[PDB]
Design an enzyme around this catalytic site. Structure first.
Site, PDB file in Angstrom:
ATOM      1  N   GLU A 164      77.085 -18.024 143.588  1.00 38.16           N
ATOM      2  CA  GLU A 164      77.403 -17.810 142.169  1.00 38.16           C
ATOM      3  C   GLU A 164      76.994 -18.957 141.220  1.00 38.16           C
ATOM      4  O   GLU A 164      76.807 -18.712 140.015  1.00 38.16           O
ATOM      5  CB  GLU A 164      78.938 -17.552 142.053  1.00 38.16           C
ATOM      6  CG  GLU A 164      79.388 -16.295 142.776  1.00 38.16           C
ATOM      7  CD  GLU A 164      79.254 -15.033 141.950  1.00 38.16           C
ATOM      8  OE1 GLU A 164      78.468 -14.999 140.974  1.00 38.16           O
ATOM      9  OE2 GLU A 164      79.984 -14.061 142.227  1.00 38.16           O
TER      10      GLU A 164
ATOM     11  N   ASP B  10      75.147 -12.374 134.014  1.00 36.41           N
ATOM     12  CA  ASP B  10      74.843 -12.566 135.430  1.00 36.41           C
ATOM     13  C   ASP B  10      73.787 -11.574 135.942  1.00 36.41           C
ATOM     14  O   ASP B  10      73.311 -10.722 135.186  1.00 36.41           O
ATOM     15  CB  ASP B  10      76.134 -12.553 136.278  1.00 36.41           C
ATOM     16  CG  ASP B  10      76.642 -11.131 136.569  1.00 36.41           C
ATOM     17  OD1 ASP B  10      76.133 -10.136 135.998  1.00 36.41           O
ATOM     18  OD2 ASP B  10      77.577 -11.015 137.386  1.00 36.41           O
TER      19      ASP B  10
ATOM     20  N   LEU C 191      83.781 -12.857 136.257  1.00 31.22           N
ATOM     21  CA  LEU C 191      83.474 -11.730 135.353  1.00 31.22           C
ATOM     22  C   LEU C 191      84.446 -11.656 134.178  1.00 31.22           C
ATOM     23  O   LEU C 191      85.634 -11.406 134.367  1.00 31.22           O
ATOM     24  CB  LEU C 191      83.465 -10.399 136.116  1.00 31.22           C
ATOM     25  CG  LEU C 191      83.383  -9.129 135.247  1.00 31.22           C
ATOM     26  CD1 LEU C 191      81.939  -8.705 135.037  1.00 31.22           C
ATOM     27  CD2 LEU C 191      84.161  -8.005 135.880  1.00 31.22           C
TER      28      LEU C 191
ATOM     29  N   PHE D 211      84.574 -10.229 145.876  1.00 31.00           N
ATOM     30  CA  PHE D 211      84.499 -11.169 144.719  1.00 31.00           C
ATOM     31  C   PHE D 211      83.338 -10.826 143.781  1.00 31.00           C
ATOM     32  O   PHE D 211      83.495 -10.849 142.545  1.00 31.00           O
ATOM     33  CB  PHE D 211      84.323 -12.620 145.258  1.00 31.00           C
ATOM     34  CG  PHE D 211      84.361 -13.714 144.206  1.00 31.00           C
ATOM     35  CD1 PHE D 211      83.237 -13.986 143.394  1.00 31.00           C
ATOM     36  CD2 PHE D 211      85.480 -14.556 144.111  1.00 31.00           C
ATOM     37  CE1 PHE D 211      83.259 -15.025 142.474  1.00 31.00           C
ATOM     38  CE2 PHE D 211      85.484 -15.592 143.158  1.00 31.00           C
ATOM     39  CZ  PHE D 211      84.387 -15.819 142.336  1.00 31.00           C
TER      40      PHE D 211
ATOM     41  N   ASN E  49      72.905  -0.120 155.572  1.00 28.91           N
ATOM     42  CA  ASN E  49      73.494   0.699 154.546  1.00 28.91           C
ATOM     43  C   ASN E  49      73.940  -0.080 153.321  1.00 28.91           C
ATOM     44  O   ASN E  49      73.879   0.436 152.218  1.00 28.91           O
ATOM     45  CB  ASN E  49      74.562   1.643 155.120  1.00 28.91           C
ATOM     46  CG  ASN E  49      73.924   2.844 155.856  1.00 28.91           C
ATOM     47  OD1 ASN E  49      73.443   3.802 155.233  1.00 28.91           O
ATOM     48  ND2 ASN E  49      73.884   2.765 157.179  1.00 28.91           N
TER      49      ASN E  49
END
Ligand code: CA
Ligand code: CL
Ligand code: CL
EC number: 3.2.1.17
Length: 162
Positions: A11, A20, A32, A104, A132
């Protein structure tokens, strides 16, 4: 290596309001602010989160505080979600950190929506699960900070952060 150092790598530490890799108004270590398109909201959300008038800038001490709060919220999010908790608790320690990271970044609702991925992880079908997970918007838009998380689900080691 640990979940904190892992997420700091993925991050970064930003002290200024930025959009972002998913396009969202964000600050600190992947905090966020809002899923709203408005910048005012970002600023009023930041003041709300910090408890003072910012003005869209914060201290490293404040970023580290939001970051602890946010890691704590991702763990509590997993444990309170009926779909995620049993899958999470089936995981070994290192895969559990990939799980916390994924929530997160993407949030509980998004993560819990990968029904097939959950079943595969629970059954220890690591390659299938990784295949997946790479079929996500997350994977395409934050590729380097998604590939490491997915590789971690595959291997069950810290090697991708080394
Ligand atoms: Ca745990
Ligand atoms: Cl373990
Ligand atoms: Cl990236």
């Amino acid at each position: 290596m640990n979940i904190f150092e892992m997420l700091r790598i993925d991050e970064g530490l930003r002290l200024k309001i930025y959009k972002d890799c998913e396009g969202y108004y964000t600050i600190g270590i992947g905090h966020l602010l809002t899923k709203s398109p408005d910048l005012n909201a970002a600023k009023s959300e930041l003041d709300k989160a910090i408890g003072r008038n910012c003005n869209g800038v914060i201290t490293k001490d404040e970023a580290e505080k939001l970051f602890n709060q946010d890691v704590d919220a991702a763990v509590r999010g997993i444990l309170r979600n009926a779909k995620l908790k049993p899958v999470y608790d089936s995981l070994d320690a290192v895969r559990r950190c990939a799980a916390i990271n994924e929530v997160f970044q993407m949030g509980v609702t998004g993560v819990a929506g990968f029904t097939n991925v959950l079943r595969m992880l629970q059954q220890k079908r690591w390659d299938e699960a990784a295949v997946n997970l790479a079929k996500s918007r997350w994977y395409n838009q934050c590729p380097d900070r998604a590939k490491r998380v997915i590789t971690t689900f595959r291997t069950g080691t810290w090697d991708a952060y080394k």
